[PDB]
Design a binder for this molecule. Structure first.
Ligand code: NA
Ligand code: NA
Lengths: 461, 229, 458, 210
């Protein structure tokens, strides 16, 4: 049970100092600036106060039940601090400190875990950059001080890339419920975390950067991940998904290369979506975060040009998604304003002559139609339109539609389109600067629907 | 219990089940095999030959033998009682003077396997995910092209079906020039049971069902290899 | 010979008007604002002047040899204008106007072409948004008023997407030598344009959005594209590269996907499946020479990005090998003991800004290094702009021209740094996979070049 | 000229070359074929069968097996007649090997194009095929061979030695030349073609006219 890890009443920071360059000090600053409302206890031999907070020489001296100890002392001091934390009844030890199994000191790491468990204490890491939980206004990392609030829980086995991607979520407008650095995974791992996020009402999507899982942990991983998948999509970025890369990634952790093909199968049986890149992972996460799953396969594509529509068709085809004729009712509605040389084969081509208002009317008609399950809206900037005008039309259409059907948007053009795409994403409408990315995002929604169906059938009685 | 086979092999310090033992064990889990009998006498070899139907194959059964053909302990295409009596004694003599210090358990009488579409069904133990089932088409398709699919056990019906359809040589199961479609349901059934074998029997390190022959109705494991730990 | 199409002395605009919403009027506006230095002749029945320029009722009335007539009148008037242009000796007719073969009027389109040819005149289009040539300060489109100057020629068979991508080049910092809308390809097509751009010293890279080639034109396409490929990379975005999409784009006959792919391979052409890939590759090919060998180095302040890079390179049939021992020695002067030198070279997340300068410099100077991909993950111990500046300085002091791509991951500061690098014409991307895919494109082109060379061997 | 075969076929209003004519035409371009003779009479069938050597195969030749001696062949001749003819084909025996398909088609855009693939299910069922637009370079032929998924079947596997890749490249290049030079040939199918550790042999050939 990790309730007290993500929602602690009291957090100790071991390794903080007057020196603002120290890791512990950076963590302490983030904790205060992000607005943690519980009690924070800096731990330091000499200082009587740090950042206006009463400092103590040891966690055991704290006149309070400490739930979480954030440990950033040198590795040769970690065990001593663990004993003190145990004495104090600390439930969770978050070991930032590196220099364990990943540098060949497997013995020290195993002892860390063994001594933690003897006190009933669980360990996160070691060799991590900390963790963040937005619902508790808790930023116990030395990464960026802030992230956008949302329903995405991001678990990373990587340190540098993890902390960098933390910042990247801001640029990509991804709302975060949680960031968790798991590093060496000496104790708490993906399984344990997935169990928590399953029960977390604040988390709707789970993205995991995964290098590998521990021997004998795979079966339980599938059991947990599949059940989670029934209600919440899981996206995995797999490090070493090629034969060649698997070997390389076995050095950075200090292990042996697991079978690529079997990992792929395990992910399929778990209903997990595997992203081959950071960009795909973020693009899919965005869509899955801001949309419900399509209730059926009747997908409509709307475009002011055949060119984008063909790119969309090809991209959908690559994902085993094939478009079908639109409902006649929808065609009639669109024909109220569209020219005679327009295509209704799906994608519906309202031609490059389309002014802004047509995007509103078309989108509205589509979303309102009972025989439409999803909509991808494609736009190519022309002199006849304004990108922001089109974006607002789509926003108004989605609102007036009064329902929640999956929508993705692809806009192509200059700086004005860049602004319009940004506007839409800040409205939590999945918008992308190309038709292929918009359609890949929509494909991700269908991929999750199919993965979830796979798990359901697999669990049939 | 069929586990007696495993326990017996282990108690004698063997790291593998004999050919006939592997088939008995596989059969008891409901996986079809080409019919076989262990002959303890010439008269039993003859009686069993009539039981199993001609033509039959005869082989020596002994832990020491590894290549029966090389040692002159495989007689093929026996069609009559007379031929079986000959093959029986030919094998006793040949092996008894090519591997003199040999502890023979008996002679194996094996049913003929009509030709069909060959399949590979495997079971291995992966460090992360434990018992895992492997599927593929036989011949070059596995041996040369390595066209195989994997599913972590236990297998659902959905796991078995999807892993079958997943392989690149799938079309060979759905009808092609000079060959009718084969029993996909039989294959799914066998895959699921192979997985169950792997989950339930910790002491089985590896299992190889190869060749397996698929027909328009049912399948038949021709050879089975089981490795112990 | 299309010299006079791209570098005309005089251009007529037929269809311009006092109404600024008319297509011809938009074209005229772009022509003036972009700074065309030749003579511009608006053509209109009534107006005596448009945008301060003496207007004429017919091209034949223009007292000057008109090289190019940009025609944007209704389709039922196009032929009439063609006859006038022919009488006037116009060499090129740029037919903006739609409503021909694409709406089922094959007869009208064929008549347009034959009547053009009877006067010795070539036709671009019809059904196009015009064309632009930067070296002649010529913007004869109704698209964006401006583009960044550079060596990339973009040919588009599609209208809406084409004109939108024209704008997108600005956002992606791609320098353009030319934009050409070919639309219906009734006459002038990709072969003719490739022939011109082959000879054009202003063009170094050619990007083509291609729906299909005309029956009986394929062999010549391969012959021309191959020779071009020897000196200049060609990137094709193929519309209908799937069976299903191929049929959709047919709404004459569905062309063979498999044969188009083979044709591209025999031409040394790189086929992009997406706009993003096409632009990402174009950027790298535009700003880098081809690697002279296979010794590619990856540099990273973290194993994670390095692994993503390895996987991405592996998917492209690119495999990294051990770095030269000399390079390892150089780097060991400042990197910690727990750094990996397996390639990617992991200088760890502890790396400050200056290490990126030193590492990049050491790599580029090393004689046994042919190419470099630099990966960066933002941490508090660094500044993205500081890292970017270090890479720029290293490239300059290196004093050579070796292929470089950059992948930077992080927040808004990283976004700014990437923008800085791209405006320096250093190919920078916001993820390690895109940086490595871009570098892969460089190697893909080197291999494509080799394919064509071997195929043309005596 | 071998073009006389094409002209004759056209003059007779035929849309295809007969089996033996196709092989003769292919042979004249330097592509190896199984030896054959056209028997117009029983005396010619026997004469030809004994000539090229046993065993031979017999099949009908008309726009509309395992024989070892004249004694056995006399039966087959009449058996085939019983079971508007141009004649009966006497074909040499082809030792088993790795089967190949070499095709030639005409694409609307790119004109004469060469197709390659391995036989049996690999082309017929899996459609594992490669294409190159003619004329073919050595680099075109080699790469299109290496490209197919069933390539490994040419480089040695259980119970089969590696085959003559150069012989295959040579045939592909010549197939392309046939397509470039002969406008009236609409389509050509060399199937089956047998690859050996040394050389290849077209067993059956189909040529369609236009
Ligand atoms: Na203070
Ligand atoms: Na036993």
């Amino acid at each position: 049970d990790l309730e007290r890890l993500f929602n602690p009443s009291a957090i100790a920071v071991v390794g903080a100092s007057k020196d603002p360059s120290k890791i512990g000090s950076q963590i302490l600053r983030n904790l205060l600036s992000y607005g943690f409302k519980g009690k924070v206890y800096p731990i330091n031999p000499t200082a009587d106060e740090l950042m206006g907070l009463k400092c103590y020489p040891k966690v055991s001296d704290v006149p309070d039940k400490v739930d979480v100890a954030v440990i950033s002392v040198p590795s040769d001091k970690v065990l001593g601090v663990i004993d003190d934390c145990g004495k104090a009844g600390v439930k969770f030890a978050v070991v930032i400190t590196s220099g364990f199994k990943e540098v060949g000191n497997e013995e020290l790491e195993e002892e860390l875990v063994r001594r933690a468990h003897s006190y009933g204490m669980r360990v996160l890491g070691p060799n991590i950059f900390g963790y963040l939980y937005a619902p508790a206004r808790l930023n116990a990392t030395f990464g960026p001080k802030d992230v956008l609030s949302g329903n995405v829980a991001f678990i990373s086995q990587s340190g540098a890339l993890g902390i960098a991607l933390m910042g990247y979520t801001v640029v990509e407008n991804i709302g975060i419920s949680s960031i968790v650095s798991v590093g060496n995974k000496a104790d708490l791992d993906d399984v344990d975390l997935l169990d928590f996020f399953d029960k977390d009402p604040n988390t709707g999507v789970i993205m995991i950067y995964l290098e590998g899982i521990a021997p004998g942990r795979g079966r339980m991983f599938i059991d947990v991940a599949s059940r989670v998948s029934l209600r919440k999509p899981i996206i995995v970025i797999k490090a070493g998904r090629t034969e060649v890369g698997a070997r390389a990634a076995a050095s950075h952790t200090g292990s042996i290369a697991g079978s690529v093909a079997i990992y792929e199968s395990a992910f399929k049986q778990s209903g997990i979506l595997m992203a081959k890149s950071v960009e795909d992972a973020f693009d899919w996460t965005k869509a899955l975060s801001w949309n419900p799953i399509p209730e059926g396969e009747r997908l409509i594509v709307l475009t002011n040009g055949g060119g984008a529509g063909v790119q969309s068709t090809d991209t959908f085809a690559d994902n085993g998604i094939y478009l079908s004729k639109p409902p006649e009712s929808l065609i009639q509605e669109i024909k109220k304003f569209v020219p005679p040389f327009a295509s209704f084969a799906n994608p519906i081509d309202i031609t490059g002559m389309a002014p802004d208002d047509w995007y509103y009317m078309g989108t509205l008609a589509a979303l309102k139609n009972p025989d439409v399950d999803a909509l991808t809206v494609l736009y190519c900037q022309t002199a006849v339109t304004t990108p922001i005008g089109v974006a607002k039309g789509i926003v108004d259409a989605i609102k007036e539609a009064g329902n929640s059907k999956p929508v993705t948007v692809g806009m192509v053009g200059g700086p004005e389109v860049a602004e319009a795409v940004s506007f839409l994403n800040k409205q939590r409408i999945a918008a992308y600067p190309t038709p292929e990315r918009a359609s890949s995002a929509m494909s991700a929604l269908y991929a999750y629907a199919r993965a979830r169906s796979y798990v359901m059938k697999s669990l049939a009685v | 219990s069929s586990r007696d086979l495993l326990l017996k092999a282990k108690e004698n310090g063997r790291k593998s089940l004999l050919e006939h033992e592997a088939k008995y064990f596989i059969s008891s889990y409901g996986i079809p095999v080409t019919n076989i009998r262990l002959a303890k006498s010439e008269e039993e070899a003859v009686n069993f030959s009539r039981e199993i139907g001609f033509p039959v194959v005869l082989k020596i059964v002994s832990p020491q033998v590894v290549h029966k053909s090389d040692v002159g302990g495989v007689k093929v295409n026996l069609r009559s009682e007379e031929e079986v009596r000959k093959a029986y004694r030919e094998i006793i003599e040949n092996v008894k003077r090519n591997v003199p210090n040999a502890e023979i358990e008996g002679i194996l009488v094996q049913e003929f396997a009509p030709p069909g579409v060959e399949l590979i069904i495997g079971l291995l133990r992966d460090p992360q995910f434990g018992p895992t089932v492997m599927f593929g088409l036989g011949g070059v398709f596995v041996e040369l092209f390595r066209d195989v699919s994997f599913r972590v056990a236990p297998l659902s019906e959905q796991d078995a079906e999807s892993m079958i359809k997943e392989v690149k040589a799938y079309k060979l199961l759905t009808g092609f020039r000079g060959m009718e479609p084969v029993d996909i349901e039989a294959i799914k059934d066998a895959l699921i049971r192979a997985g169950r074998i792997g989950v339930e029997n910790e002491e089985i390190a590896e299992m190889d069902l190869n060749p397996v022959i698929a027909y328009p109705k049912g399948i038949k494991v021709v050879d089975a290899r089981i490795i112990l730990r």
